[PDB]
Structure 1
């Protein structure tokens, strides 16, 4: 159904006129994402506007992402949908208003991201990918820092399922078996962890996409450096995530039992204040 907004257990009958446009969020999108304030409850939400006049391929990925998000209402590690509005010319998709992605966080930091923040990020992303494979049999196929969203309250969720499968992403984070033919998102997560932990994308100085694919297959997996104080569990988790042979790469339920994940499930990391600190320096 449409015309409703479920923000915090309570449902609210609403139309597009009940939301005040506070401006466009982000310059480059897969569809116009607006910051909007719900006049009836003061809630500020993120509303993606899909025009029926828009691009055919872009609208297909928007609906595919919306399909997965509507199915993931019980996963706390996936950005939640609040409702939809279908007009004669547009489709508005209201979603959880996050802060920013991990890519923009890396640009604002102008350096590495602490391990304690990446530890909480790993636990959230791995469980989100595990929820898609078991509860819905869905593969993400585009795990990257730009698809990891954080907010003022320390939440870390996964966001874009535009090219998700039911069982091609960015070439920079593609697994070897996806270039030269299940657990391909595990490799993408490992590549994203190295980029955020070092501040430098591991495959450096690649002018074309095919050259990146060449380095993925020809070069050794880019492991975590050993002169940055990374814990033994962090370097161990990245090594298993970046196993070249996918048959030896651990499935999720073995990853969820890794000492790196088990540590940051119980550990109390103040991601909310670290996020608020970095955001104060643009």
Structure 2
């Protein structure tokens, strides 16, 4: 159904003219996203705008992302859709895109992200990927820090499913078996998460000084997997978790049900980490 806004738990009958445009948001990865204010209540939401005369290749990825979002309404680690508006020339999609991606948090910190923050981030992203495969048979195919969102209340969610498959991504985070496939990609997203954790924990992308896309894939296959350094005070569980996701042989790479039993995961499922306070202090460093 269209023409409804469900901010929180209250459903409001609304149209596009009931929202005030406050300017553009992000980089326009999937499509043009607006920061808008609902005049009836005062809430600020993110609204995608898909034009029927727009690029048909971009419009296909927008509808594919929306399809996965709509059927993932019962997973708390995936961004939610608040409503849709269908006019004769546009489609407006109200989503939970408020907050900052992990890539922009890295640029503002100008340094490593603390382990206690990456622990809660790992739990949310692994459970989101495990939900997609078990309940829908979907693989993400593009796990990277720019697709990991954090908000004011300390929530962490996956967002972009534009190229998700029902069983190509950035070359920097491509698993070895997606570069050199034998004869199988259920665990390629696990490798992408491992590279993302190394990049955020150190503030440096592991495959450095590559000037072309093909050079990155060469070093993924030719060199040993980039491991977590041992002189930054990282716990033994964190180093053990990263080493498991970064197993080059995908047959020996652990499974989601096996990863969800790791001591690193079980620790931050129960540990109380104030992600909201850490988020506000990093956001309060204007640059």
In 2, Cα distance between the equivalents of 1:196 and 1:249? 21
Q: CA deviation at 1:97?
A: 3.9
> Given that residues 109 and 278 in structure 1 are in contact (C-alpha distance below 8 angstroms), is that contact kept between their aligned partners in structure 2?
yes
Deviations 1:3-38 (A, max 9, x none): 111221221111101111111112443211111111
Unmatched segments (≥5 aa) in structure 2: 180-184
> Given that residues 121 and 156 in structure 1 are in contact (C-alpha distance below 8 angstroms), is that contact kept between their aligned partners in structure 2?
yes
> Given that residues 140 and 164 in structure 1 are in contact (C-alpha distance below 8 angstroms), is that contact kept between their aligned partners in structure 2?
yes
Report the counterpart of residue 182 of structure 2 in structure 1: none
1:272–1:126 Cα change, 3 Å: same
In 1, Cα distance between the equivalents of 2:71 and 2:221? 35
Deviations 1:137-164 (A, max 9, x none): 1000000000000001000000000000
Q: CA deviation at 1:56?
A: 1.1
Deviations 1:206-231 (A, max 9, x none): 11111111011011000100011110
1:246–1:171 Cα change, 3 Å: same
Report the counterpart of residue 131 of structure 1 in structure 2: 131
In 1, Cα distance between the equivalents of 2:2 and 2:207? 44
In 1, Cα distance between the equivalents of 2:29 and 2:130? 26
Deviations 1:241-267 (A, max 9, x none): 100001110110000000000000000
Structure 2 residue aligned with 1:211, among 209, 215, 220? 215
Q: Normalising to structure 1: TM-score of the pair?
A: 0.98
Q: Normalising to structure 2: TM-score of the pair?
A: 0.96
Runs of 4 or more consecutive aligned structure 1 residues displaced over 3 Å after TM superposition: none
Unmatched segments (≥5 aa) in structure 1: none
> Given that residues 176 and 217 in structure 1 are in contact (C-alpha distance below 8 angstroms), is that contact kept between their aligned partners in structure 2?
yes
> Given that residues 61 and 162 in structure 1 are in contact (C-alpha distance below 8 angstroms), is that contact kept between their aligned partners in structure 2?
yes
Deviations 1:181-237 (A, max 9, x none): 811000000000000000000000111111111011011000100011110000000
> Given that residues 141 and 165 in structure 2 are in contact (C-alpha distance below 8 angstroms), is that contact kept between their aligned partners in structure 1?
yes
1:233 and 2:237 equivalent? yes
> Given that residues 44 and 97 in structure 1 are in contact (C-alpha distance below 8 angstroms), is that contact kept between their aligned partners in structure 2?
no
> Given that residues 5 and 12 in structure 1 are in contact (C-alpha distance below 8 angstroms), is that contact kept between their aligned partners in structure 2?
yes
In 2, Cα distance between the equivalents of 1:199 and 1:212? 18
In 1, Cα distance between the equivalents of 2:265 and 2:37? 36
| SS at structure 2 position matched to 1:152 | coil
> Given that residues 147 and 158 in structure 1 are in contact (C-alpha distance below 8 angstroms), is that contact kept between their aligned partners in structure 2?
yes
Q: CA deviation at 1:43?
A: 1.3
In 1, Cα distance between the equivalents of 2:55 and 2:132? 27
Report the counterpart of residue 148 of structure 1 in structure 2: 148
User: What is the aligned residue count?
Assistant: 281
Deviations 1:74-118 (A, max 9, x none): 100001110111111111110114211000000000010000000
| SS at structure 1 position matched to 2:108 | helix
Q: CA deviation at 1:172?
A: 0.5
